[PDB]
Write a protein that binds this ligand. Structure first.
Ligand SMILES: [Mg+2]
Ligand SMILES: [Mg+2]
Ligand SMILES: [Mg+2]
Lengths: 129, 220, 81, 119, 65, 195
RNA sequence: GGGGCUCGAAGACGAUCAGAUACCGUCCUAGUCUCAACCAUAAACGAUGCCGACCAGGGAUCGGCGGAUGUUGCAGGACUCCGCCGGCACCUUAUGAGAAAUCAAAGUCUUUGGGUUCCGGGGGGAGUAUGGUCGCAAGGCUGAAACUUAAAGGAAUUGAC
């Protein structure tokens, strides 16, 4: 059964990205999916995306710009403090120069650099680079 | 001594090039080995192995020696040549020719800081050749090459100074091991870093902007 | 890419496909580059052209023709036709 | 057996290719021309070449073959440029339009073209 | 960078290097000390300095002396 | 010339007819299908597709390295011209493998552009051009792969009128773009049609 | 317990053969059929656990439904064309994977993480010994150790046969 809609969204988006598609459809939508997409768009890895209200769960149509190499969730959502971020950076990321890890801290959903800025920890949602 | 047989060699011979990065820029199919002789100033050649393979005939076993050669100055250029011949001399010479023909550029990045003379691969890069998978991961300035003898030789000739390597599969197979190492060294220039994604400008290919001297001035 | 001085450190900057944005490797021999010339109001080629590059992946897919057609329709709008 | 070595086949093809002007049908004329237009050591090789050339003249006197060239019909050019009628084969009136093509000309095209037909 | 457990021992390490004649006055960053090599250390041995000060005819005469 | 004249001419030449089916490409080019299953490929898009092809091919000013290929023995006459009207070269019928990759072959000639009658018939030059960065233009019909051809004109390659008229129209607009054909009319009355 | 045509483990005879408790012929017992109870194993195989998402194309076919269509010695049924859902498969091709055969899933894997069950750790000894447990029995489930060994094995290649 659909146990993690975030994984389905990220996997469909990555599969469409590898095939050179310019748009991708994500169903069902959710607030955490929207926040993850907002972070990715703010850092400049995707472009426009619009939520469509189907009165049941909503869909998302996302516009790709070819800049996204990989994006994927981490399951189960392990708990990381501020001192463990570096370790996870050495595991999920290509290099220390770029890449991003998404954390769902109690201050919201953000990237790992912002979490270090605010000195807060939380669980790991996924990653993208 | 040398009579060019292709447009690229005919273009090179009189001196219409300085380096070979413009040939890479248009992904031109280099097919004459004197082009890399003229363009790349320094080339070093060490043979890696001379493996005798056999084919069983009705009379006996026909043996042929297959030689592996690694080419490239330790400044970002490297190439790999494999040649199987009747005896070792022609195998080595042909493998040298093929290695010089197969020179590719490698991308060297930094670990955490931009103090000059980059010394490491920019990203985490992997290469698979049959079963042998090799991975290189960036390393700090003083690490050095952490690899077996074969990837160490390939990376030394490629110009890498420090890197962290892994391996999986039957690395005893020298052909697959060295081919995976070289293949992923090619992939080092393939990752799309956030710096590369500034919009691209286009430049006339050597076949297109040298049309004046390529219509019918055959060899004069 | 960029040193602390602010200079180039890699040998060259590659081309990236004008359809899928993925870069073109130095050993990509299926990657091609097309110059589409422009004309005047009478229909005379004026010597200037618009350049597109296609990687081997998009060609081997079979979407090279559609991608190039779409790129030309989009690009001709700015520079008229 | 009686099949011809690639050398005699090749040399016969070349002598016909460059010396079709004067060489004739009789075998003895062919060999007396071969002996001075080319240097053949074995006399019986020369006889084989002459007979083979005679056989290909028998072949060619009915029509062209796939072996020789030059004066590229058999001896004289200008075979198909003369097939230019004083009127073009492509007509412009009542030109082969059906129902779905009529719907097309109702689309972006002009439905009042000169060659529109109700067929 | 703003971690005190980086600043304090970074200053200490650079101080030790500048004290032992390993890092030059133009290399006051933690990156330069990663580029150190064995001959830098072997250049500071008493035998090496005695040889290079002209007091010894050879680096083996220096050790013997 | 005006698109109306060319459209009515290819209507006369039956260039709009398709086949019983189509691949998952070329639906951007078809218009619909007849009750018999044939396709009615929209000549309107074909017009500016071959016009953009003409824009492409008068851009290199060295027409020597433009081989027009035709493996089928039905459009050889059209490919025979279009090589002296323009400066392009043309190989008809048989294409020896290695002429684009083997640099020791006597017929080694690397182009800057390839023109092909049909991607289905001479697929070998397509696959060989894939190894030399050769841009490719072909007159694809329905049931024709898009595998490596880069610009595809949606026309018919099985008709006496379709081939020939289409090649002449392409060459006419190419000479017009080159400027040799100042506003005028045809001086190349149909010769390429099969004997 | 019934039934018991045909076929046929065991057994007998003929034949072949250096020998033939086999292959070949003939006659046949338990069995093969059925009812009421036991057994719980098969190359029980797609040698591919179940649920979910995505990622190429194509035509055919089965069930249902929507539309168009113009023929039936007769709205509907039969037939033709298009489309949707569900199923058994098939063809082409990697831009994918794989040691390869090959696979449109055996793909989306060092750029490694959707959920969950079972299960393997070089080849033998060995599915053996013993204990436990189910069965009338034949047997099933669970299941070692000492010792021995440098290979056993998979896919493909060239010869030889
Ligand atoms: Mg079992
Ligand atoms: Mg049905
Ligand atoms: Mg074991």
């Amino acid at each position: 059964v659909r146990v993690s809609v975030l994984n389905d969204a990220l996997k469909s988006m990555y599969n469409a990205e590898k095939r050179g598609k310019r748009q991708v459809m994500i169903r069902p939508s959710s607030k955490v999916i929207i926040k993850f997409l907002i972070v990715m768009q703010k850092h400049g890895y995707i472009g426009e995306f619009e939520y469509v209200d189907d009165h049941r769960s909503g869909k998302i149509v996302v516009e790709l710009n070819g800049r996204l190499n990989k994006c994927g969730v981490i399951s189960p959502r392990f708990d990381v403090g501020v001192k463990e971020i570096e370790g996870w950076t050495a595991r999920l990321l290509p290099s220390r120069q770029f890449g991003y890890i998404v954390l769902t801290t109690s201050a919201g959903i953000m990237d790992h650099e912002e979490a270090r800025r605010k000195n807060v920890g939380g669980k790991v949602l996924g990653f993208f680079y | 001594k040398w009579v060019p047989v292709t447009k690229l060699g005919r273009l090179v011979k009189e001196g219409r090039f300085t380096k070979m990065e413009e040939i890479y820029l248009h992904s031109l199919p280099v097919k004459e080995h004197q082009i890399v002789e003229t363009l790349c100033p320094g080339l070093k050649d060490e043979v890696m192995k001379i493996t005798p393979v056999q084919k069983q005939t009705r009379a006996g076993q026909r043996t042929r020696f297959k030689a592996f050669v690694v080419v490239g100055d330790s400044n970002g250029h490297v190439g790999l040549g494999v040649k199987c011949a009747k005896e070792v001399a022609t195998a080595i010479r042909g493998a040298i020719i093929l290695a010089k023909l197969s020179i590719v550029p490698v991308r060297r990045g930094y670990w955490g800081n931009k103090i000059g003379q980059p010394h490491t691969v920019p990203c985490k890069v992997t290469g698979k050749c049959g079963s042998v998978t090799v991975r290189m991961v960036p390393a700090p300035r003083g690490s050095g090459i952490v690899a077996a003898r074969v990837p160490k030789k390939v990376l030394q000739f490629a110009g890498i100074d420090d890197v962290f390597t892994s391996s999986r599969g039957s690395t005893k197979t020298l052909g697959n091991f060295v081919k995976a190492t070289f293949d992923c060294l090619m992939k080092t220039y393939g990752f799309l870093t956030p710096d590369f994604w500034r919009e691209t400008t286009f430049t006339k290919a050597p076949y297109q902007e040298f049309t004046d001297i390529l219509a019918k001035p055959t060899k004069a | 890419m960029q040193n602390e001085v602010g200079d180039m450190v890699d040998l060259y900057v590659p081309r990236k496909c004008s359809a899928t944005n993925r870069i073109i490797t130095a050993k990509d021999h299926a990657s091609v580059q097309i110059n589409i010339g422009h004309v005047d109001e009478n229909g005379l080629y004026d010597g200037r052209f618009t350049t597109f590059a296609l990687s081997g992946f998009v060609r081997a897919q079979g979407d090279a023709d559609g991608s190039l057609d779409r790129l030309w329709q989009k690009r001709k709008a700015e520079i008229k036709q | 057996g009686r099949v011809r070595t690639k050398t005699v086949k090749k040399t016969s093809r070349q002598v016909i290719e460059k010396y079709y002007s004067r060489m004739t049908l009789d075998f003895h004329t062919n060999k007396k021309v071969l002996e001075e237009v080319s240097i053949l050591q074995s006399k019986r090789l020369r006889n084989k070449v002459a007979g083979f050339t005679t056989h290909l003249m028998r072949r060619i006197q009915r029509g062209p073959v796939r072996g020789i060239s030059l004066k590229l019909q058999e001896e004289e050019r200008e075979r198909r440029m003369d097939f230019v009628p004083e009127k073009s084969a492509l007509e412009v009136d009542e030109i082969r339009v059906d129902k779905e093509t009529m719907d097309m000309l109702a689309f972006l095209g002009m439905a009042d073209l000169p060659g529109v037909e109700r067929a | 960078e703003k971690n005190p457990r980086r600043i304090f021992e970074g200053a200490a390490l650079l101080r030790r290097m500048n004290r032992y004649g390993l890092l030059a006055e133009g290399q006051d960053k933690l990156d330069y000390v990663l580029a150190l090599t064995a001959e830098n250390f072997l250049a500071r041995r008493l035998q090496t300095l005695v040889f290079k000060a002209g007091m010894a005819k050879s680096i083996h005469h220096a050790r013997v002396l | 010339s005006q698109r109306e004249q060319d459209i009515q001419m290819m209507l006369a030449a039956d260039v709009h007819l398709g086949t019983k089916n189509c691949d998952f490409q070329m639906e951007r080019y078809v218009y619909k299908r007849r009750t018999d299953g044939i396709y009615i490929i929209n000549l309107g898009k074909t017009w500016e597709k071959l016009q953009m092809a003409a824009r492409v091919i008068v851009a290199i000013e060295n027409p020597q390295d433009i081989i027009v290929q035709s493996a089928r023995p039905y459009g050889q006459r059209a490919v025979l011209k279009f090589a002296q009207y323009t400066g392009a070269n043309a190989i008809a019928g048989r294409h020896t493998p290695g002429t684009f990759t083997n640099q020791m072959q006597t017929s080694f000639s690397e182009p800057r552009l390839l023109i092909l009658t049909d991607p289905r018939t001479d697929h070998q030059p397509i696959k060989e051009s894939a190894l030399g960065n050769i841009p490719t233009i072909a007159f694809c019909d329905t049931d024709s792969p898009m595998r490596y051809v880069d610009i595809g004109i949606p026309a018919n390659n099985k008709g006496k009128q379709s081939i020939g008229c289409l090649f002449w129209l392409l060459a006419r607009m190419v000479l017009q773009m080159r400027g040799t054909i100042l506003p005028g009319h045809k001086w190349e009355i149909m010769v390429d049609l099969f004997f």
